[PDB]
Copies of this chain bind each other. A is one copy, B any other.
Amino acid sequence: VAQGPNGRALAESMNPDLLSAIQQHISIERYASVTYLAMSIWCAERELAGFYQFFDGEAKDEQSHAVHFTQYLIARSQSNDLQTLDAPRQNWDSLASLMATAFQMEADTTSSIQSVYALAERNSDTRTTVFLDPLIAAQIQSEDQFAYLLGRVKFANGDPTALLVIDNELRAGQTQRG
C-alpha cells in the first residue's frame, strides 16, 4: 500500500495538474463566498434586508461547498493548499448591477467546475467526474435561481416600490421560481 501526498493510504494517484485545478477551484468557491458576503453588506447598507439575508446565506453555503472540496482531496489522499483570498468587489451603482455580478459569479463558478471536469476526463479520473456530477446539478439550480432573481429585479426597472416587494419575497424565503 502506497502513501499519497497528504500521508494517507492512496487508492489511486492523481495527476498533479488536476490536483492544482481542484485547489484553484476551492479558491473560486471561497471567493464566491466572500463576494456574497460583500453583497449582503451592500444590501444591508441600503435597508434591503431580504437581499441581505439571502446573500448572507449564500456566503455560508459557498463556504460549505469549498469545504466539501477540501474533504474530497482528503479522501483522495491529496494535499490541500488553501490560498491567499483576494478582496471582493464591494461597490455597485444599483441592485440590478449587483445581481448581474452575482449571476456572473455563479456562472463563473460553474465554468471552473467544468474545466476541472474536462481535466478529469482527459485523465480518466472517474472518481472526480462522479464527485463533480451532483455539484454541476446544483450549479444548474443555482444558475436558474440567480437568473430568476436577476430577471425579477430587472423587471422592477429601478422602481423602489417593486424592489421593496421583491425584498420582502426574499426575506420570506421566496427565492426561486418554484
Contact = CB atoms under 8 A, between A and B. Distances in A.
Contact of A162 (B47, B127, B147, B164): B164
Given A136-B130, A161-B165, A171-B178, A45 B8 contact: yes
Nearest to A146: B9
Nearest to A177: B49
A124 B152 CA distance: 30
Interface string A70-100: 1110111100111111111010000000001
A119 interface: no
A168 interface: yes
Given A47-B152, A52-B177, A136-B126, A12 B164 contact: no
Contacts of A136: 126-127, 130
Interface in A89-131: 90, 100, 103-104, 106-107, 110-111, 114, 117-118, 124, 126-127, 130-131
A9 B150 contact: yes
A7 B151 CA distance: 9
A74 B104 contact: no
Interface in A128-178: 130-131, 133, 136-137, 139-141, 143-144, 146-148, 150-152, 155-157, 159-166, 168-169, 171, 174, 176-178
Given A47-B148, A84-B84, 9 more contacts: A7-B46, A9-B100, A11-B107, A110-B127, A130-B140, A156-B164, A157-B160, A162-B164, A168-B169
15 contacts: A11-B103, A38-B82, A41-B74, A41-B82, A49-B148, A77-B147, A80-B90, A84-B84, A130-B140, A131-B140, A155-B160, A156-B160, A165-B165, A165-B168, A168-B174
